[PDB]
Amino acid sequence: VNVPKTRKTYCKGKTCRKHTQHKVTQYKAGKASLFAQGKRRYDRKQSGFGGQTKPVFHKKAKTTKKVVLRLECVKCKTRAQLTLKRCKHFELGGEKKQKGQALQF
Amino acid sequence: AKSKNHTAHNQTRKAHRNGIKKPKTYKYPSLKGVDPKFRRNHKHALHGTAKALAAAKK
Amino acid sequence: HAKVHLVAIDIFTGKKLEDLSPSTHNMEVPVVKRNEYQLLDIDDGFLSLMNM
Amino acid sequence: GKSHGYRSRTRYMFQRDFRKHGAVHLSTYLKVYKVGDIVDIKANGSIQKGMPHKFYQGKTGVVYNVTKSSVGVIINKMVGNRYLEKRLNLRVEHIKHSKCRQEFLERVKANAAKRAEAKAQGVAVQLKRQPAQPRESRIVSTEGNVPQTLAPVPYETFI
Amino acid sequence: ARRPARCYRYQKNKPYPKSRYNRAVPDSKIRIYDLGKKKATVDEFPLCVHLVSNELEQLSSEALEAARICANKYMTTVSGRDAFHLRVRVHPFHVLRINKMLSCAGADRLQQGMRGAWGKPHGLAARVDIGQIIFSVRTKDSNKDVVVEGLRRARYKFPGQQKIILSKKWGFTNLDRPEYLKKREAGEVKDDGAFVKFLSKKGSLENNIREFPEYFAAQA
RNA sequence: GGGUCGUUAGCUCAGUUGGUAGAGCAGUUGACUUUUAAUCAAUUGGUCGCAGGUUCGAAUCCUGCACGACCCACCA
RNA sequence: GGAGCGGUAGUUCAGUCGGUUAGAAUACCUGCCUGUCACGCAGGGGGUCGCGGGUUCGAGUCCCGUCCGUUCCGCCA
RNA sequence: CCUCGCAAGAGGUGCACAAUCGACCGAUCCUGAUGUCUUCGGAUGGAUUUGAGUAAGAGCAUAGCUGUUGGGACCCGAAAG
RNA sequence: GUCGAAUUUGGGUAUAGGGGCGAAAGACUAAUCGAACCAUCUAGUAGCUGGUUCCUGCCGAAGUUUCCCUCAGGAUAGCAGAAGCUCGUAUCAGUUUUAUGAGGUAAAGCGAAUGAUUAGAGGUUCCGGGGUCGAAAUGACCUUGACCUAUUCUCAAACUUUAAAUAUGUAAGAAGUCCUUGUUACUUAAUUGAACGUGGACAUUUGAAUGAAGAGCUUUUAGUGGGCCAUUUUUGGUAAGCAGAACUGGCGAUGCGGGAUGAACCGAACGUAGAGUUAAGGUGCCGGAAUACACGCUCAUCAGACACCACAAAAGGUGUUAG
RNA sequence: GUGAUUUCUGCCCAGUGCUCUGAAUGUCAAAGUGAAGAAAUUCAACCAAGCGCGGGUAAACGGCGGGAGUAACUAUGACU
RNA sequence: UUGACAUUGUGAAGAGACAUAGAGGGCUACCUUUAUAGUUUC
RNA sequence: GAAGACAUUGUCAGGUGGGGAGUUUGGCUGGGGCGGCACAUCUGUUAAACGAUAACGCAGAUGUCCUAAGGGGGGCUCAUGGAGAACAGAAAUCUCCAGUAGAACAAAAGGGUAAAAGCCCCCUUGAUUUUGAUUUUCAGUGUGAAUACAAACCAUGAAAGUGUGGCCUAUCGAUCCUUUAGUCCCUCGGAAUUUGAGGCUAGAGGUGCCAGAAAAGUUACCACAGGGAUAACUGGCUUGUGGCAGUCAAGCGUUCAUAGCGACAUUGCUUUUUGAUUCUUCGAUGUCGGCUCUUCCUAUCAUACCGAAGCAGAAUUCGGUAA
RNA sequence: GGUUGCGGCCAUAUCUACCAGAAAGCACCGUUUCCCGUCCGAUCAACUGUAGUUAAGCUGGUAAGAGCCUGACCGAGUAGUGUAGUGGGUGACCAUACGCGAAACUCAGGUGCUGCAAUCU
């Protein structure tokens, strides 16, 4: 689905506590990194013999992912999340619908 | 292994052995999930009306 | 427990490939769409396509 | 497979009833609900918000809480061995007043009056409703109205 | 071809018509539900006999066909084709189903016992009651001795026993014979094609004039 | 042995899923040619082997019917 | 006794499962070449995408039914 | 239990217990006062919030039926490793 | 069968177990081989079989719910017990009454919508074709073809105006009603409402019947979680002593009288005896009991004989009887 | 692997293997190298063999099709 | 099987890659192209 | 002698590696498999008029879609038919009349909807933040979905109000781990600072076997535990199918329904075929045939006595008593 | 009693085809500078009750009208159904007792009532 890049939603950040302009960006998990205990704990278990110690997942049934909108409040640059129902298409940009015009040839 | 799937047979006959005991209600029911505003108001009312009977009637 | 041996010729590369698996377990299916582009002049090694 | 939605098997339950479609009439809304009053629950398909579950169609119970456009009603649902006390949140459009309770209240009102009358008489009332007592010894009157004698009637084809 | 009608005799299941759920059926065998003088003004044929079914049961299309044809041929060869106006007062809507198994040695490719047991359609049939009427006839009152023998012949081609009673009332319409005569000689009838229309004391009195000039005037 | 399907003009083929038969080949007749053949055109031949209902009426619907063509046939 | 597949100019087939267009080869037709036919040269038409219904801005491809043909199973006794 | 009542009853006190509305203690989310190495500090006041709480302690140790768990675990019983 | 050699064999000697040897059969390896043997780990493990040791007394089930790599199992709730605790005629009751709610099934209905459908009548067309009358015509007239009007015969698990019976919710008051008036940070234009109250009244028909071998309340734990038959309702199925449900009853778990016999049918449920009375069934004899009483029907060179239940059909017959 | 002699062993290198005295900077570990950072470390290029890209090989495993029309009776179809 | 480090030593050349300068090119990344004080990979 | 800091050897690293090792291979399932999913869900019907309900019962549907198809207001009335207007025709645009909904509401099906929830316009983010309470499926846990509220801060409207997603019923996920958001808060436990890491509250990344394991075959060499809960032989009930018999009688039979036949229909019987079933047997009833030998049954091939004949004789047909 | 504004119930009020309406009431009807909105002063906006009507609307009446309603020993104790029987029936089913009880049809009767405020010969 289409959503617009702007959204005047509620903001909680001490000074705000009211409805303000947010900049609406797609969440993306970023890098996973070592040094997390849960990674180290894994690596240590892995090392040596036995081989694959932990369950590797296979049976995927979902095609899509649920979408998350990282919002940034323009005033205090304090952020917040918002999650939608699932979908295949997505565009955080514009291109709004036209009312009832003719089909493209 | 085609086993019997479901029935409600001989269930009522279990039920009536101890037998559908009713809720057993109390005067002064539990104000839980009653309007918050109302509850707040009633609180203050009770606080006040206690005072009236406590301080005056002696 | 019946297996299935497919033979499939690539869309892109073109080579002739085969597989054999029991048929319940999934072979994950790619998703396909046509862009119906209109082709203007072909420049250098690329083509040049015009969406309507 | 099997299916059990929130409106499972409710084709004819929330049917709007013949030639009474639409436009939720306005007595409904001005009927004033006091706390601890008994109310019947006729669901109303012409309003979707605040609807009851199918189980509570025709079921009756006590109001416990009020709000802006709704009422909290308690009912005794039957489950397994026991009665469990529920807490619904029905919009006012699905509710009417218990007529029977009103009737009862009227009876009580009469009772006080009867007691008062008795007092100015000098006690002795008999106020409970006794059932249909086995009707008394009486004398009938023939005078003109003679026993109009009947007989059995013979079998006839007419088909 | 066709398992005996003993299977589908009694009303063991619910009714099951040719609907938006059940289609691609077998077509009914009995097509012609009337015969004889089908453009017969009712003032021609005063008699009637009904072929009344005594028992609550179903009737296959075939049975209704064979019977109809039997009664038909026995009338027309004897009395003459315009001596009568034989209707059938029942239509086969209810459908029959069959599972259908393999015959000579089905052991390995068996179609699995009682699995997927819901059958495809088989043949159409009419649901029938105690005292319910199969076949009208209506003739001249002298012609009774023909129809009585025809219906007699035809009843043999049905499941169970179904009796052959004698009606009154210029029998296709309602309204008894002498009463009908009274209505006629009073002028309370217009001879609508095939079947008779009747006067009323309801509709606006303008449209009872052009339809019925007779009833109220002193002429007739 | 049984279930299914088909039997059409001298021979073959559509038949329309119910009101008059279409097309090819064959035969005859004319055109053409010095004769012919090939070709071109025109005609001749049709109750679809026998019953019952019959849509006004049926080879074409259905069921019987005799000659073919398919599909099936103990068991351990 | 069931499951899956096929369906298009006169023929073999793409198109088609992507819905707001029917393409190839051969055959057919016309003119040309040639003493005449073939080959060739230059042009031309021809398919309600088997039938019937439905969904659809639009169905040939989307769904359901006959319809005619091709495949798969018929294992343990 | 006391009081009055010849008794019937009435009135007072009402443990344990049951329901409830409050008070407090902690976490949460607000509030932020007097003071302030001017970033510390936390008063008081709140809240459809929540805790296995306090609200004049009820525990500990041995012993007996019972039921659980780990154990050769009611007894016998593999194919195996 | 082969019998001069790819021969047969003695002794010595070599190869050792998931290893050997194998002119290959998974053959052979001390009667063991699709992985020897002996000991130990080991009393391995077993949601599966088998058994599981004295008497009496009391109470006495389930085979259903939800979850599980669950479908022979377990958790779970339910049923059952034992321990009691708090009170002492409470407030309740597999029930009726009076009252009032909801329901969309059996029925009915379709000249009422929704569809399904038999027939003709009359209209209609310039707004469908095929004809005759005409060079043509928003033409003179027939044949159909749909439409329209009034009628017709027929229908429906997934159609309905209508609409039962049976089952079903709630009230039948002390925690009530009224009169006066207090509370508040809620609400009101308003000490109006609001919920909660002190005070005063109204009680022995305190507000329908009948019943209450006490009422309520907590603990804990066993077995169970394969069911089955019968009346009626009912889905698949040609049908089944088949399969699957609905409401009660049974049987499992239960003997006794009667169904000759039979788990479930009828009768009726058992402490040990005597008496008397019957239930269901019977009463020629085998059996205890009337070869009782009364009115009739039947002649069977295939009689008939009492439910569940051990069969019978469509069709006939001046055999007979009555209408 | 086949299985005396005789006679013969056709076509297929796409798949799967096997193989190549085979190019390249596609993929590329560890160490080593460079940058950044207070350092842990982060990021980078470089990059073995293989994998990939191409070449060979079938007494290697193996495999080796449909549908129409057409001869001057009918049929059949060298021929298309 | 291949790589790295260790085994672990003595030398000689000849070439490539990183940093500064000069040219012939499609303000400008690079592309081909010579030279310098150092290091390094062969 | 060769060979030379190369090999060889050691340690790490990537490849290769059924040669070998361990393990594996789901459930439901009128036996198993093959087939489906009835395994998470939703609609209508089955369902037996509250709810509750089964089957591999019936007809369908879901893993999406939508910054508007959400939210508020305003304006208007839809499908269809009638009658008309250059090109205009079954349909292109317009206009009046009728028009209870025969339309349109993102998508199945059922509800619901008429100054509307439908269409056109206007302004917008309530598809927002904090945390409860509640209903549904229920164990009264979860998950999902929903309802009524509060306390905020907004939306729109003149206002009354209405709005915490899509008119309503489906549209979707636990632990651990990673990641983000927030409070910029608490810990690194000898003390600090800064990196790093770990905590808290709210989400995301997925388990469709959908209350959530990382998993391919084969056995005719097989094995163990069990199973009549369950197949294959018999027996049983049942009959579709098989066989056999009627009743009716259109037609055949030159003429003529029934000498002999006998369509379309129809009511049976049979346990000799095959199926359908799973009650009995899986600590085993020896499972096809042929041989051999006994009886039994007729639904009568022949033989005895008969009647019927489309019986002149002969032959042959139909029937009756007869095993 | 009529009529207006606001209603409650929601057709005993709606629909078809006609005819009556004095008083006031609405009602149509006159006009576009301003506020306002339309393709268009039709719609809605504003300005005039002045320039004109009862033609429509609205109200009321009429019709053996449709429809709707209300009741009836009207059908009909009809179907249908709860309870019981070692009741009948080869069965399908039917009768019996204790009870409960419809729809169509037929007939007759009705065709809005009424609250709040204002106003009318």
From Swiss-Prot, chain B:
Source organism phylogeny: Eukaryota, Fungi, Dikarya, Ascomycota, Saccharomycotina
A Pfam cross-reference name: Ribosomal_L29e
Gene Ontology cellular component terms for the protein in this record: cytoplasm; cytosol; cytosolic large ribosomal subunit
PANTHER family recorded: 60S RIBOSOMAL PROTEIN L29
Comp. bias regions, Basic residues: 1-25
Gene3D superfamilies per record: 6.10.140.1730
Molecular function GO labels: structural constituent of ribosome
Underlying gene: RPL29
Region annotation Disordered: where it falls in the sequence: 1-36
Any further remark recorded for this protein: Present with 51100 molecules/cell in log phase SD medium.
Function: Component of the ribosome, a large ribonucleoprotein complex responsible for the synthesis of proteins in the cell. The small ribosomal subunit (SSU) binds messenger RNAs (mRNAs) and translates the encoded message by selecting cognate aminoacyl-transfer RNA (tRNA) molecules. The large subunit (LSU) contains the ribosomal catalytic site termed the peptidyl transferase center (PTC), which catalyzes the formation of peptide bonds, thereby polymerizing the amino acids delivered by tRNAs into a polypeptide chain.
UniProt entry keywords in alphabetical sequence: Cytoplasm, Isopeptide bond, Ribonucleoprotein, Ribosomal protein, Ubl conjugation
GO BP field: cytoplasmic translation
Protein name: Large ribosomal subunit protein eL29
Subcellular location: Cytoplasm
Crosslink position(s): Glycyl lysine isopeptide (Lys-Gly) (interchain with G-Cter in ubiquitin): 51
Signal peptide span: none
Main localization of the protein described in the UniProt heading: cytoplasm
InterPro entries assigned: Ribosomal_eL29
Organism encoding this protein: Saccharomyces cerevisiae (strain ATCC 204508 / S288c)
Family: Belongs to the eukaryotic ribosomal protein eL29 family.
From Swiss-Prot, chain C:
Glycyl lysine isopeptide (Lys-Gly) (interchain with G-Cter in ubiquitin) crosslink residues: 33
Coiled-coil annotated spans: none
Subcellular location: Cytoplasm
Transmembrane segments: none
Summary of subunit composition and partner proteins: Homodimer. Binds to 80S ribosomes. Actively translating ribosomes show mutually exclusive binding of eIF5a (HYP2 or ANB1) and EFT1/eEF2. Interacts with DYS1 and LIA1.
Note, other: There are two genes for eIF-5A in yeast.
Identification of the protein by name: Eukaryotic translation initiation factor 5A-1
Organism: Saccharomyces cerevisiae (strain ATCC 204508 / S288c) (Baker's yeast)
Gene it is expressed from: HYP2
Section covered of the full-length record: 54 to 105 of 157
Swiss-Prot record, chain D:
UniProt entry keywords in alphabetical sequence: Cytoplasm, Isopeptide bond, Ribonucleoprotein, Ribosomal protein, Ubl conjugation
GO annotations of cellular component type: cytosol; cytosolic large ribosomal subunit
Cellular compartments annotated: Cytoplasm
PROSITE patterns in UniProt: RIBOSOMAL_L21E (PS01171)
InterPro entries registered for this protein in UniProt: Ribosomal_eL21, Ribosomal_eL21_CS, Ribosomal_eL21_sf, Translation_prot_SH3-like_sf
GO process terms (BP): cytoplasmic translation
A GO term for molecular function: structural constituent of ribosome
Organism domain of life: Eukaryota
Site of covalent link Glycyl lysine isopeptide (Lys-Gly) (interchain with G-Cter in ubiquitin): 31
Other known facts: There are 2 genes for eL21 in yeast.
Role noted for this protein: Component of the ribosome, a large ribonucleoprotein complex responsible for the synthesis of proteins in the cell. The small ribosomal subunit (SSU) binds messenger RNAs (mRNAs) and translates the encoded message by selecting cognate aminoacyl-transfer RNA (tRNA) molecules. The large subunit (LSU) contains the ribosomal catalytic site termed the peptidyl transferase center (PTC), which catalyzes the formation of peptide bonds, thereby polymerizing the amino acids delivered by tRNAs into a polypeptide chain.
Subunit structure: Component of the large ribosomal subunit (LSU). Mature yeast ribosomes consist of a small (40S) and a large (60S) subunit. The 40S small subunit contains 1 molecule of ribosomal RNA (18S rRNA) and 33 different proteins (encoded by 57 genes). The large 60S subunit contains 3 rRNA molecules (25S, 5.8S and 5S rRNA) and 46 different proteins (encoded by 81 genes).
Curated annotation (Swiss-Prot), chain E:
GO BP annotation list: cytoplasmic translation; ribosomal large subunit assembly; translation; translational termination
Listed name of the protein: Large ribosomal subunit protein uL16
GO cellular component, one term: cytoplasm
Keywords: Cytoplasm, Isopeptide bond, Phosphoprotein, Repeat, Ribonucleoprotein, Ribosomal protein, Ubl conjugation
Keyword check for Ubl conjugation: yes
SS bonds (residue pairs): none
Gene3D superfamilies (UniProt xref): 3.30.60.300, Ribosomal protein L10e/L16
Compartment list: Cytoplasm
